[PDB]
Amino acid sequence: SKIIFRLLLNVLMSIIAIISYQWYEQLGIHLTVAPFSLLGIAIAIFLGFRNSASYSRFVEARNLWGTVLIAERTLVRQLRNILPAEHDAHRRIVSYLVAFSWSLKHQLRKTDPTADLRRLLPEERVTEILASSMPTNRILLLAGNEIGQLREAGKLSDITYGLMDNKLDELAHVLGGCERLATTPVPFAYTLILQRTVYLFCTLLPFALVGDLHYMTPFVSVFISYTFLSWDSLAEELEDPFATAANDLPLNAMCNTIERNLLDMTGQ
Amino acid sequence: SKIIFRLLLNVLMSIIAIISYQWYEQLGIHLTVAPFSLLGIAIAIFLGFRNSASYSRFVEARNLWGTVLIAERTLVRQLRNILPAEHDAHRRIVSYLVAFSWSLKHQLRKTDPTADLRRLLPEERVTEILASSMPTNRILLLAGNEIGQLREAGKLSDITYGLMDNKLDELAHVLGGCERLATTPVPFAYTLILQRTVYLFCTLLPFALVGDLHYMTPFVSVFISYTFLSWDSLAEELEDPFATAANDLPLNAMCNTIERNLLDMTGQHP
Amino acid sequence: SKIIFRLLLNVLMSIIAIISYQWYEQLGIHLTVAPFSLLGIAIAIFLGFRNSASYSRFVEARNLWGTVLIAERTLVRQLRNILPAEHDAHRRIVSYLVAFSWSLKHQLRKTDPTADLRRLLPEERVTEILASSMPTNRILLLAGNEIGQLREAGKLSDITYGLMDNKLDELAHVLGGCERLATTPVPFAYTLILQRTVYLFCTLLPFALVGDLHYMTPFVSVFISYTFLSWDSLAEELEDPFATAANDLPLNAMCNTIERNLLDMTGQHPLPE
Amino acid sequence: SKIIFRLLLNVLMSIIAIISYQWYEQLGIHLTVAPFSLLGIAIAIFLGFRNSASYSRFVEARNLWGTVLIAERTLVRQLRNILPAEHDAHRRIVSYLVAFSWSLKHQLRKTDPTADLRRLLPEERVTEILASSMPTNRILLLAGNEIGQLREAGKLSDITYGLMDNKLDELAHVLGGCERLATTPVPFAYTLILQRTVYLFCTLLPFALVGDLHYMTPFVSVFISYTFLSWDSLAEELEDPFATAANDLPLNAMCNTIERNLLDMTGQHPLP
Amino acid sequence: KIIFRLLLNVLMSIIAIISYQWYEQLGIHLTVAPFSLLGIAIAIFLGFRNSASYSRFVEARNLWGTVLIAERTLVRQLRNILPAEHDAHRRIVSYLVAFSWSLKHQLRKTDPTADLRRLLPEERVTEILASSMPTNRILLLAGNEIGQLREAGKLSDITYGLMDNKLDELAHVLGGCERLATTPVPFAYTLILQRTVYLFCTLLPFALVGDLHYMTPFVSVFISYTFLSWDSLAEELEDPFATAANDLPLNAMCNTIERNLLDMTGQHP
Ligand SMILES: N[C@@H](CCC(=O)O)C(=O)O
Ligand SMILES: [Cl-]
Ligand SMILES: [Cl-]
Ligand SMILES: [Cl-]
Ligand SMILES: [Cl-]
Ligand SMILES: [Cl-]
Ligand SMILES: [Cl-]
Ligand SMILES: [Cl-]
Ligand SMILES: [Cl-]
Ligand SMILES: [Cl-]
Ligand SMILES: [Cl-]
Ligand SMILES: [Cl-]
Ligand SMILES: [Zn+2]
Ligand SMILES: [Zn+2]
Ligand SMILES: [Zn+2]
Ligand SMILES: [Zn+2]
Ligand SMILES: [Zn+2]
Ligand SMILES: [Zn+2]
Ligand SMILES: [Zn+2]
Ligand SMILES: [Zn+2]
Ligand SMILES: [Zn+2]
Ligand SMILES: [Zn+2]
Ligand SMILES: [Zn+2]
Ligand SMILES: [Zn+2]
Ligand SMILES: [Zn+2]
Ligand SMILES: [Zn+2]
């Protein structure tokens, strides 16, 4: 919300344009409104499409996280329905699945998963997971071992193993999705072009408006400025949905909901 | 329609603009249409996009609900097709699937599912369901136990169990999808910014219009005001598709349809 | 075309604009182009977004019917490749799949399917289907019984059953999709808001145009009006793609195509040496 | 372009507008920019959305054809991986898969597939396929029989049969997708209505521009017309991606790509 | 490379100023209004186009994502299902890594021989370079490894099926990338817009001069920048497999894939 600084700067640019309107003819500078409508409308169209792309990206982040909840739910359900007896296996997989949620969060947030992982897994596993450059992936592999061992123990057939393997695939896609979102930002050129253009437009605007609106200039100018900046900053906040900002995803809340959901499903 | 108030208030502002037009040069105020055209078209573009995004949420909401009927239909079908004899299993599973629907509706409406659950299931189950933090997910698990037990008893093979398991996974996707839409709407910036913007534009508009239209100012002002507000409030409505507004989903109607479908003729089949 | 009444009314609205142009400022009423440019554009943006939604809905409808053909083709093909000898089963399943198509058509068209169902199926089955509150879904169940009986008999394994079952799932999605599109229209509020704004904008336009064009008003006002009315009525035809309008789906032809297709894949009287 | 006729008719309309503007006052017929500006922007928005839909259809066609390549590749891969010894089967299936591609291309183009089928299949099959009203569908069924026979011989299990059968479903989905996409006039005359709206706008525009640009009318008026006519005709092209009035290069290229690919995969190499 | 036209705009604006005094002398009028109409039209058309170009970029980024995902899970499956078959692990992983690099080369239209020799025995490198599509060949070879394990009875049809599905997924990636390479948005699009945006940008000062006088160049360059920025950004996103500044870092992505697959096989980069 550094926007209020930019709004103040606009009012200052407006009064400058008022006081210096007297010297217009003298300096030989003529500025009509029509060419600034053309520019403004274009910027609005471009901002419109840009804002759209940003929203889609935010939506995708939400979906991928939604999939974690879904896929981890059904995997646990599958475990209970196929092997209701093997509570030993349940606890191990549920922990791994809960670890995955937290590991992914920390990975995306660029924070330290050590505390959460130690809260969930034995140390032999925790140090092994943190040993991998890709810890979240390492958790999936370990979760895969449990299903694999259950198959080798003959407790799962190839079919029932396959039924569960699909859920690990689903989470692999989530990990992939999130990494792609995190590592690949919306092209820097989008923020580079638009911010330059919008800021300079808002700044130059009163100098074209002053000829027409005179004193009313500051009000009409700041209002158009507000509109364009608000739209522009919304797209900025949507672009990176894994940031810690107030407009972003409450990942902690989701990870807690996932953890509570799985522990609820095992009677813990 | 809370638009009518703002539409009426717009006519009041339009009278103010007519009577105060003479005094423009005295008060040192000049207002042309051109700047408001620029601002208006920009607001229209942004409203245009916003509304589209809202309709999307509505459409996805509707699709998620359509999947319930589809996946529930086929699961029953599969049961009727693979185990045509097991009517006791049929009835138990159906009642769960029906419970899932009503439970989901209550969840998204944040209302009490107790009445509907008792109507459908034994009390030992109603307490088990209301015990859970997520009752709808609990219902899925119970539905799952039924399919699971038919496999323990060797009535279902791994293959046919899987075929039916797939359908529960489908419902789980519906559950998660709906939660996504419900628990977190669009950003809160979207609503508070645009609503203020659209109305501040609407109130200032006559003051800029009066120069051109004079008396016809209130007419053309309320027209534009309507067009902009109509779109914003509709967008606002469709953003929460699980709410109780006019343009939202008839979830009650939908849950009936699901129920009637699953109990086709008291759950009978040749 | 009930659009042509609105164009005539536009001509008449232009004419009164021309003649009553005198008693304008004498009262004090003024109408310029720039404010109607803003409104017009706002309306054009809103129409554009709505039409987009309507087209999507039309595409989806076309897509869903597209799937019926794909799924029934493959289900018949699967029966041919897995159980090549069982032509009794073929004809039974084929007929149900044809029945499904016609039943679904009648359901969306809100017409009686008894004729078609009797043409295709024995009377016990027509009774069975019409007894259901959801007849088309009942046909799928019956189709599923055929596959299920072949599994009971051990002619199909659980795998081969599964392969065929998943095709019924496709048809189940089609049925659900179509029903959804039939009962969930583009929210009425859209069609309501746009219908009011477009009509009001078209009638007031020649009054806001007369100042600038004087006599040329009727010729310009109509051209603008027609544009907004054409684009609006395009959406109103695409939102209801199951009726018997000019823009709607030829569901009868498509049903024939499906009946033709399945009787092309079968129909080869087998065992003639 | 072939739209250079309407660009010339524009310049001719400009010259009419210049010379005749003198006799405008002696009636009281005027044309400002403001109304035609509104009309133009409105049309542009509509053209914008229409074009978007067209491009969408074009992309979907490219996807469906891309799937033929993918599915036909993986089916052949599966055959080599699961039944490496069964080359006679490899050959027959590959024949049908290549047949499917060409037969689909011909179907959508409404052109004669005889030559292409004759190069790939015995005249017995070619007659059978062309006897059917749905020849591409027939080829899929024939390819299916081949996979089915390997199963009945016990060479494929129900699982491995399933795996390959899935690929034939993909091709079936593609055939249907293409059939829908080729034979779907989503608007009846609304593609012509908007086209005529662009036509009239472009021919009335100089009469509205003359007051402001005078002689520079033809210069600006043709440029505006060019933009509108180009965008309209582009949407018209993308609308019908399988049209005889479209580009055949990509469709023929793909059929050759798939053929080259499938022969490479079975080591047969080029077919004469 | 745009700053050449940004300059040419200022020059054309100067021409517009110095030749404004000859305007009525020649009898040429240019108002802003008709250029607003044309400007907005182009802005709408650029707006949609840029949107389309983005989709291609996102799809390409998505397809490459699947490579990481599909290969990760394929290795995971090998480890979970055949934990003792480390010969198979290494061979398959080498093919998966080969596929990644070969795809990078395929799309960039470069020579894969360097990378192939680093990863595979020489007989295979020949077999691969012999094929019309080398990447497709690598998948077939990866498929042979799974197929061999099946005949040996180490994999059931079901477990073979599970692994096969991942090769199918990569085939889809191959097809997808191939489609985004070989088929750009047709010739028409760029030939229309690029010329149109240019001609508009250079003719705009002539129309702006009346209203703006000297301020012409400043306003005209501002509009021109906006229109050209958007136009060129769209062009960069259109071809996502190029080596341009705002394009997929395919070298970096292939490293990530290789590192991930090494990590999973208990090896070190
Ligand atoms: N393989 C071609 C021969 C022509 C050529 O390669 O030039 C055919 O028989 O159709
Ligand atoms: Cl437990
Ligand atoms: Cl997957
Ligand atoms: Cl438990
Ligand atoms: Cl289903
Ligand atoms: Cl029952
Ligand atoms: Cl799932
Ligand atoms: Cl007044
Ligand atoms: Cl038959
Ligand atoms: Cl061969
Ligand atoms: Cl995967
Ligand atoms: Cl390993
Ligand atoms: Zn799932
Ligand atoms: Zn347990
Ligand atoms: Zn223990
Ligand atoms: Zn630490
Ligand atoms: Zn389903
Ligand atoms: Zn029953
Ligand atoms: Zn007045
Ligand atoms: Zn299918
Ligand atoms: Zn038969
Ligand atoms: Zn595939
Ligand atoms: Zn071979
Ligand atoms: Zn002059
Ligand atoms: Zn995958
Ligand atoms: Zn190993």
Whether the Cβ atoms of residue B179 and residue A239 lie closer than 8 Å to each other: no
E86 is in an annotated binding site: yes
d(CA B262, CA C133): 10
Nearest CA in chain C to B37: C38
Whether the Cβ atoms of residue D99 and residue D120 lie closer than 8 Å to each other: yes
Instruction: Look at chain B and count its residues.
Output: 270
> Measured in whole angstroms, how far is the alpha carbon of residue A18 from the centre of its chain?
43
Residue type, E153: G
Residue A13 tokens read as: 């640019």
Tell me, yes or no, if D155 comes closer than 8 A to chain E by beta carbon. no
Whether the Cβ atoms of residue E106 and residue A216 lie closer than 8 Å to each other: no
Using alpha carbons only, what angle is made at residue D55 by residues E194 and A40, rounded to the nearest 5 degrees? 50
Backbone angles phi, psi at E112, to 5 degrees: -85, 0
d(CA E269, CA E263): 8
E168-191 b/e (C-beta count within 10 Å ≥ 16 → b) = bbbbbbbbbbbbbbebebbebbbe
Backbone angles phi, psi at D251, to 5 degrees: -75, -40
Best mutation target, D51, D205, D231, to test chain E (most E CBs within 10 A)? D231
Neighbours of D87 (CB within 10 A): 14
Cβ–Cβ gap B51/C46 under 8 Å: yes
Catalogue the long-range contacts made by D223-226 (C-beta closer than 8 Å, 24 or more residues apart): D223/E38, D223/E199, D223/E200, D223/E203, D224/D40, D224/E34, D224/E37, D224/E38, D224/E41, D225/D6, D225/D7, D225/D10, D226/D7, D226/E196
d(CA C80, CA C78): 5
- Whole-Å CA distances, E67 to A100, A135, C159, E103, E173: 21, 19, 30, 10, 7
- Expressed in angstroms, the distance from the first to the final Cα of chain E is 38
Whether the Cβ atoms of residue A74 and residue B169 lie closer than 8 Å to each other: yes
Residue B111 tokens read as: 């209302």
d(CA E66, CA C88): 45
When CB atoms are compared, the residue of C62, C223, C246 closest to D39 is C223
Q: At C45, is the secondary structure helix, strand, or coil?
A: helix
Nearest to D7 by CA among D207, D222, D194, D200: D222
When CB atoms are compared, the residue of B43, B133, B144 closest to A260 is B133
d(CA E194, CA C46): 29
> Measured in whole angstroms, how far is the alpha carbon of residue C198 from the centre of its chain?
24
d(CA A238, CA A51): 8
Residue D108 tokens read as: 């959508």
Using alpha carbons only, what angle is made at residue E107 by residues E102 and E110, rounded to the nearest 5 degrees? 70
Residue ranges of D 48-77 with Cβ closer than 8 A to chain C? 48-49, 52-53
Whether the Cβ atoms of residue D70 and residue D124 lie closer than 8 Å to each other: no
Q: Report DSSP state, residue A214.
A: G
Q: From the DSSP assignment, how many helices (H) and strands (E) are in chain A?
A: 11, 0
Q: B219 vs chain A: nearest CA distance in angstroms? A: 23
Neighbours, chain D (3 or more CB pairs < 8 A): C, E
Tell me, yes or no, if B37 comes closer than 8 A to chain C by beta carbon. yes
- Write down the experimental method used for this entry: X-ray
Instruction: State which residues have CB under 5 angstroms from ligand 26, the bound ion.
Output: E 86, 89
When CB atoms are compared, the residue of A30, A48, A53 closest to E54 is A53
d(CA A33, CA A29): 13
Q: C263 vs chain B: nearest CA distance in angstroms? A: 26
Burial classification of residue C63, based on how many CB atoms lie within 10 Å of its CB (0-12 exposed, 13-18 middle, 19 or more buried): middle
Nearest to D265 by CA among D79, D116, D64, D66: D79
Specify the resolution in Å: 3.1
d(CA A75, CA A166): 9
When CB atoms are compared, the residue of D33, D55, D231 closest to E34 is D33
Q: Report DSSP state, residue C155.
A: S
Residue type, D12: L
The alpha-carbon radius of gyration of chain A (Å, integer) is 27
Backbone angles phi, psi at A240, to 5 degrees: -115, 95
Whether the Cβ atoms of residue D183 and residue C242 lie closer than 8 Å to each other: no
